[PDB]
Amino acid sequence: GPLGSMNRVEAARNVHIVGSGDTTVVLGHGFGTDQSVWKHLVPYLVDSYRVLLYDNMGAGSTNPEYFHFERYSTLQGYAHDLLVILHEFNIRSCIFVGHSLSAMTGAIASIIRPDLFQKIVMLSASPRFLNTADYLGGFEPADVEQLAGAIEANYKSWVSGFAPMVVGGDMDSVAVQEFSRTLFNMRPDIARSVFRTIFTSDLRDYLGRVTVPCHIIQSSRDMAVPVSVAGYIHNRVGGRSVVEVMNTEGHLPQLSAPEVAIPVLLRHIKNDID
C-alpha cells in the first residue's frame, strides 16, 4: 500500500508499550483472551516499569488484516516469535509474566536466551493438560473431547459453554463476558487449530533446562490446572523457584479475582527469590 510495507506479522502480535523504568515487564496471555486480560495489573506497574504487552495464540484473528503465519502452528514457534519481539523492541533483560501456556512459551524462550529473562512469573501454568498413567494434568481423553465439543460445528455455541467453564464463577460476570468477547475476536478455524495445539502440546521435558528464577502462581480451584501442577513445575525447574497457590477460583484470576490475584502478582514481580 501507499502508507508503506504491509507488516502483517507486526499486526498479529499487536505489541503495545506503556509506562517507564529501568526494567521491562513483558505480559503474555493464555488461549481465548488477549492483552486486555491484564487490565487490572497494568495500572499498578506503569509507575516503576516499562510494560510490553502482545497478543498470541490466534487472538484478534477476525481482524481481516490478521494472517495466521506458519510459525504459529506450534508452541515452539510462539517461543521463537517471542524472542524476535524481545530483539526488535530492544529488550536486554525483562520480567516475563506468562498466563496459562504463555508461561511455557516464556520458559522455552528462556532456555535459548536466559540472558533476556530476569525471571519468569507463571500464572495458571501447565506443562501438559492430558493425563498419563504417572502424570496428573487434569484431563482424561473424555474431558478433552468434551471440552472441544462444538468448537468447529458451532463456534457461537461452543463459546457460551467454554467461557464460563474456564473462567469459573457465574455466566453473567464481567470476566466471562470479557472472555467470551475475546473468543469472538478469534476466527473459528484458528481457534480450532490453536485449541488442538494447546491440548496436544507436552512441554514437561523442557522444565529441567529452565535456569532463570520461576515464580509459580495459580488459583487453588482452576478446572484446567490441578493444584499439584504448581508443585510439579517447582520440583522440576533447573533454577530457583517459589510457589504461591491462591485461594481463588478460575483459570483467569487476574481478570476474575483481581482483589486477590493482583497483590500476589505484584509481590512476585517486585521481589526476588534469594
The span from the CA of 131 to the CA of 27, in Å, is 28
Q: Is 55 a catalytic site residue?
A: no
Pairwise CA distance, residues 229 & 217, whole Å: 10
Among 56-64, 82-90, 114-122, 249-257, the segment contacting Na ion (CB under 5 A): 114-122
85: how many CB neighbours lie within 10 A of its CB?
A: 20
Of 29, 34, 222, 268, the catalytic one is: 222
Does residue 222 carry a catalytic annotation? yes
* Burial of 150: CB neighbours in 10 Å, binned 0-12, 13-18, 19+: middle
Does 251 qualify as catalytic in the annotation?
A: yes
Kindly state whether residue 209 participates in binding Na ion, applying the rule CB under 5 A. Answer: no
- Using the structure block, give the residue that is written with the C-alpha cell 509474566: 97
Question: Based on CB atoms, which residue is closest to Na ion, 54 or 117?
Answer: 117
Nearer to Na ion by Cβ, of 251 and 268: the residue is 268
Nearer to Na ion, 42 or 91 (CB): 91
Q: Determine the size of the site formed for Na ion (CB under 5 A).
A: 3
61, 100, 102, 256: the catalytic one is 100
Q: From CA 134, how far away is CA 100, in angstroms rounded? A: 22
- 41 contacts: CB under 8 Å, gap ≥ 6: 27, 97, 254, 258, 262, 265, 266
Q: CA-based angle 104:159:216, to the nearest 5? A: 25
Q: Which is nearer to Na ion, 149 or 238 (CB)?
A: 238
Region from 16-24, 132-140, 190-198, 208-216 binding Na ion, contact rule CB under 5 A: 208-216
The binder of Na ion chosen from 23, 48, 71, 114 (CB under 5 A): 114
Q: Which of residues 115-144 bind Na ion (CB under 5 A)?
A: 117
The residue (of 72 and 117) whose beta carbon lies closer to Na ion is: 117
Residue 212 near Na ion by CB under 5 A: yes
Rounded Cα distance between 55 and 125, Å, is 17
Question: Is 161 one of the binding residues for Na ion (CB under 5 A)?
Answer: no
What is the DSSP secondary structure assignment for residue 222, as one 8-state letter? B
Which residues are the active-site residues?
100, 222, 251
Residues that bind Na ion (CB under 5 A): 114, 117, 212
